[PDB]
């Protein structure tokens, strides 16, 4: 108690003390020249992480798990980069991913050595290893968007630290050296391609994107040794020629215009369509051709006539039907030809395409040669059973090739046959094709759905092509409209009308063939969804009064963590304390009338001579109605159990701000009227508020309270702040209900108990607002911001500020600063920041909010982040279920095992694919909640912005989930991207079909 990190300091089992970690940080900072006011920031960050993990496990397990998560495990990003770009082991990882189905100098040897080295480190060494990465991540500015560049930098610095060069140096490195010598040149490269210097200003230059290098094109250079080998100093010498321990010292001479290039280019859109989705045209067009040729004898029948009913030879039916194979082969060849014009020629993985072409031609040949033999006139005139057996054989060869090219993905067709030493894959398997597999009942459900859809569709399409088209084809193709025509051309425009009509008929049927599979998809999903309700046991027929009567027991079992508490009270005295809280919260919002409340509360009015009559259940159990109904309804679905609020982890709520209105001005209140509009729109609230005015009461106070009342009904930031500060009071209520010994022992000192409750609720929840224009508000906006800091003392605000240049006629200096409500007032009228961190320039290069969140992201704390926006709202009864929502990431109630144990193997591990996103509802999903360690080590929380984050998390190897008992109160270019190129050409067939028919 009265200590900052009680779960680590107040314990006697801690392997490393606080005063032994502070000097580790100080030593690194002296040696490599970081900034002091960032070293302090990251020391705070690290300590809060240790506290959060050690409150539900042992301290040593906490340190070990953090080390596994950041540097040394199979859930680390640094290990993946190290194995791909240093040990050159991409193809083996691809093979292992392919053969995991049967699995459950060599990859096993390298993994054995890595585990052996990581199993014998002292705790001091683990603290040093984690600290260096965090220190580097704290300065990296815009290089935070590019993770593998950061991994390269960290590796170089670590190689320098352990050298005899560093440990014999006397004087320290001058401060600010890391940012001046290493980080600024990369930022200069990045900016020098969207802007240009004209007459002393930066003006955006216009040029085609095929000549602009973005974040991804930098990021991808550090995925191969071949890219690492291109980095050149000013002498013309290569970087990788130097011994390992000297490369960090020179990392300021590297010239980045001669290095970075473009890695993926755009073209006309139909080419993208043809390449990304080939598996669907192969399976529609070929079968249509089969069906149409079998039922259409007239075109290959000698002296065809229905009157004589003569049919052609069966050899001709089979040889005609057997062109589906050549059609499928031709489609695949065209797809590869279109793909060859997306990627640079010499970049790694582009030789594979060439080989893929050769094999394809071979298949084309074997599937066209034999048919010609049947259609050669040598065997035309002589009937043989040889022709019949040939046609019969080629029919099934054609069926086989249609199925084969409909199932297997394009990237990864003939990888197992080359057995070559060079690159076997077009794109990196570590960072692009690491999908998380399915397990259990849903895996079979996915197979069954698609089998059913396609069986129904094909059997139904045949029977509506057989009759709607057999007679028109036979008639329009054989009639003779004998006429002279127009002799300028001839009769060639009067014998050809029926056949032009026939071509148009067939074309419309061909187009209609594509619209039927969508219908069957919809129908089969709706039937399966209805059928699964019975297994899920969904009861909508039950009366509304049959949910409200079961509400109390659900509250007792699912909202409270009663199991841990020693049973000393009746369940009524626990449920009373929650029910009354909800009701009074609604009442005070001017949302219920005085006489409505008394109908609902638990009452103590009965006599106190008998303790049993003190409490009586409400009459209810024997806008407001909508809220209570949804609360009770959502409680019926299964909910995971909670932890005591002394074991729950830390989390942050992050908000952006630009141009929105904090509070309503008086001009907009008295002029045009808004007040009359609102009163006509919310009349009963207006009369309740005026009743409240006469209850308590120029009149400045009336002015301010009217302003507040009007702001709590419109698009204001104060509405959102006041809504989302309900988490604090929820945590205080839960903490005080769960354990009454504290409330007893304090014994009337309400003030001391208030300090205790606030102190606990302060270390579990953080609020962060990012304003990028606080430096240049006009005075009334500044007045509003100061008012907010006065109403809620614990709120935090981050902003940007500027200083004049050190030397005349140069660039001004730029800093990122933090304040809250406990900083004192300067005589200038401003507040002193807690932290100021210097940047390498203006951080806003592209439009959007992504750059807004990137600069304030270094000030977050905890393990989980909630991303909200400027206009959003929340309620107490919803905020009361945060523990159950957070337990959805599958980390709170699991046992702990040593990651580096000699006996374990990769296939036995159960921690391979973590959960990255959880989205709420009333693989697409807007990310409400975010796993911060997973996300912040592989690029930002957002990117230049929401669906792309979900697709990147999926490609990297995470999982996305949906929660059905939480609500969020929110109220063309895609098809040319890399993400579609990677998803379309590498997913297995059933997942691909599910992805295609949604978006």
């Amino acid at each position: 108690p009265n200590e900052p990190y009680p779960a680590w300091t107040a314990d006697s089992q801690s392997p490393v003390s606080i005063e032994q970690i502070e000097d580790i940080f100080i030593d690194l900072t002296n040696r490599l020249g970081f900034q002091r006011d960032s070293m302090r920031n990251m020391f705070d960050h690290f300590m809060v992480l240790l506290d959060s993990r050690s409150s539900r496990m042992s301290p040593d397990q906490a340190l070990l798990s953090l080390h596994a998560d950041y540097i040394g495990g199979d859930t680390a990003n640094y290990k993946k980069w190290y194995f791909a770009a240093q040990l050159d082991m991409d193809d083996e990882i691809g093979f292992r991913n392919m053969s995991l189905g049967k699995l459950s100098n060599s990859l096993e040897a390298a993994d054995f050595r890595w585990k052996a080295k990581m199993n014998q480190l002292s705790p001091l060494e683990r603290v040093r290893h984690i600290a260096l990465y965090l220190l580097c991540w704290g300065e990296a500015n815009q290089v935070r968007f590019t993770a593998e560049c950061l991994c390269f930098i960290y590796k170089c610095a670590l190689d320098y630290l352990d050298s005899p060069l560093c440990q014999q140096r006397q004087e320290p490195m001058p401060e600010g050296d890391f940012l001046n010598r290493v980080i600024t040149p990369i930022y200069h490269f990045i900016r020098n391609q969207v802007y240009e210097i004209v007459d002393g200003r930066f003006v955006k230059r216009e040029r085609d994107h095929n000549k602009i290098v973005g974040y991804d094109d930098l990021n991808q250079l550090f995925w191969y040794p071949e890219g690492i080998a291109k980095i050149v100093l000013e002498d013309g010498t290569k970087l990788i020629e130097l011994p390992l321990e000297e490369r960090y010292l020179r990392l300021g001479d590297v010239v980045w215009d001669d290095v970075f290039f473009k890695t993926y280019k755009e073209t006309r859109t139909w080419l993208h369509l043809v390449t990304n989705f080939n598996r669907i045209w192969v399976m529609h067009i070929s079968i249509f051709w089969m069906y149409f040729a079998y039922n259409s004898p007239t075109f290959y029948t000698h002296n065809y006539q229905q009157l004589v009913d003569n049919q052609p030879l069966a050899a001709y039916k089979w040889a005609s039907c057997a062109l589906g194979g050549t059609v499928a082969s031709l489609i695949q060849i065209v797809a590869t030809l279109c793909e060859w014009s997306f990627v640079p020629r010499k970049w790694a993985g582009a030789q594979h395409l060439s080989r893929r072409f050769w094999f394809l031609c071979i298949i084309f040949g074997i599937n066209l040669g034999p048919i010609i033999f049947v259609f050669a006139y040598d065997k035309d005139t002589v009937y043989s059973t040889a022709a019949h057996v040939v046609a019969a054989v080629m029919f099934f060869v054609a069926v086989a090739t249609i199925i084969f090219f409909s199932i297997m993905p394009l990237g990864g067709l003939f990888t197992s046959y080359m057995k070559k030493s060079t690159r076997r894959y077009v794109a990196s398997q570590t960072f692009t094709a690491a999908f998380a597999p399915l397990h259990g009942l849903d895996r079979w459900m996915s197979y069954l759905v698609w089998v059913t859809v396609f069986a129904a569709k094909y059997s139904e399409s045949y029977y509506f092509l057989v009759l709607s088209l057999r007679d028109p084809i036979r008639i329009l193709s054989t009639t003779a409209m004998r006429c002279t025509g127009e002799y300028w051309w001839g009769a060639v425009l009067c014998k050809v009308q029926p056949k032009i009509v026939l071509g148009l008929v067939i074309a419309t049927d061909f187009i209609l063939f594509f619209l039927d599979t969508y219908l069957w998809y919809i129908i089969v999903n709706t039937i399966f969804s209805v059928g699964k309700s019975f297994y899920l046991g969904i009861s909508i027929l039950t009366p509304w009064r049959n949910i409200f009567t079961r509400l109390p027991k659900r509250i007792y079992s699912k909202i409270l963590a009663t199991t841990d508490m020693e049973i000393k009270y009746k369940p009524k005295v626990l449920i009373s304390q929650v029910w009354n809280a909800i009701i009074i919260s609604m009442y005070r919002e001017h949302l219920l009338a005085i006489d409505h409340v008394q109908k609902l509360l638990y009452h103590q009015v009965p006599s106190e001579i008998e303790g049993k009559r003190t409490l009586r259940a409400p009459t209810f159990f024997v806008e407001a109605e909508r809220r209570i109904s949804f609360f009770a309804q959502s409680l019926s679905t299964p909910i995971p159990e909670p932890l005591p609020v002394d074991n729950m982890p830390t989390f942050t709520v992050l908000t952006p701000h630009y141009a929105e209105r904090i509070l309503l001005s008086l001009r907009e209140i008295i002029r045009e009227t808004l007040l009359e509009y609102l009163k006509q729109l919310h009349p009963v609230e207006w009369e309740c508020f005026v009743k409240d005015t006469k209850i308590l009461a120029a009149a400045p106070e009336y002015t301010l309270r009217t302003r507040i009342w009007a702001s709590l009904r419109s698009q204001t930031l104060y509405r959102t702040i006041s809504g989302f500060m309900n988490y604090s009071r929820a945590i205080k209520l839960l903490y005080r209900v769960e354990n009454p010994e504290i409330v007893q022992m304090f014994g009337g000192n309400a003030e001391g108990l208030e300090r205790e409750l606030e102190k606990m609720a302060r270390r579990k929840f953080k609020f962060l607002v990012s304003m990028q224009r606080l430096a240049k508000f006009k005075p009334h906006e500044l007045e509003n911001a100061e008012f907010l800091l006065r109403a809620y003392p614990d709120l935090q605000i981050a902003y940007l500020d500027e200083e004049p240049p050190l030397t005349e006629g140069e660039e001004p200096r730029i800093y990122s600063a933090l304040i809250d409500g406990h900083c004192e007032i300067l005589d200038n009228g401003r507040r002193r920041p807690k932290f100021r961190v210097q940047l390498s320039g203006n951080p806003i290069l592209g439009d959007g909010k992504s750059d807004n969140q990137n600069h304030a992201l270094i000030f977050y704390r905890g393990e989980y982040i909630q991303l909200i926006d400027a206009n959003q709202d929340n309620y107490l009864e919803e905020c009361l279920k945060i523990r159950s929502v957070l337990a959805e990431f599958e980390e709170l109630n699991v046992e702990q095992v040593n990651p580096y144990a000699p006996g374990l193997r990769y296939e036995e591990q159960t921690t391979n694919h973590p959960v990255a996103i959880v989205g709420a509802r009333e693989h697409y999903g807007h990310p409400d909640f975010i796993n911060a360690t997973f996300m912040t080590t592989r690029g930002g929380v957002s990117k230049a912005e929401d669906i792309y984050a979900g697709m990147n998390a999926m490609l990297r190897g995470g999982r996305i989930k949906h929660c059905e008992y939480y609500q969020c109160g929110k109220g063309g270019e895609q098809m040319l991207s890399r993400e579609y190129y990677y998803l379309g050409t590498q997913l297995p067939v059933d997942r691909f079909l599910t992805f295609y028919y949604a978006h």
């Binding site: 005063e19 002091r36 070293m39 705070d44 406990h822």
Partner: peptide, 25 residues
């Protein structure tokens, strides 16, 4: 006087700063 933050001394260690923040409340 510190370089990035003029209002703080140079020699002030991180734990001194956390103690100061604690006393500010």
């Amino acid at each position: 006087a510190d370089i990035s933050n003029p209002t703080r001394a140079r020699d002030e260690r991180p734990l001194d700063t956390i103690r100061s923040f604690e006393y500010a409340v």
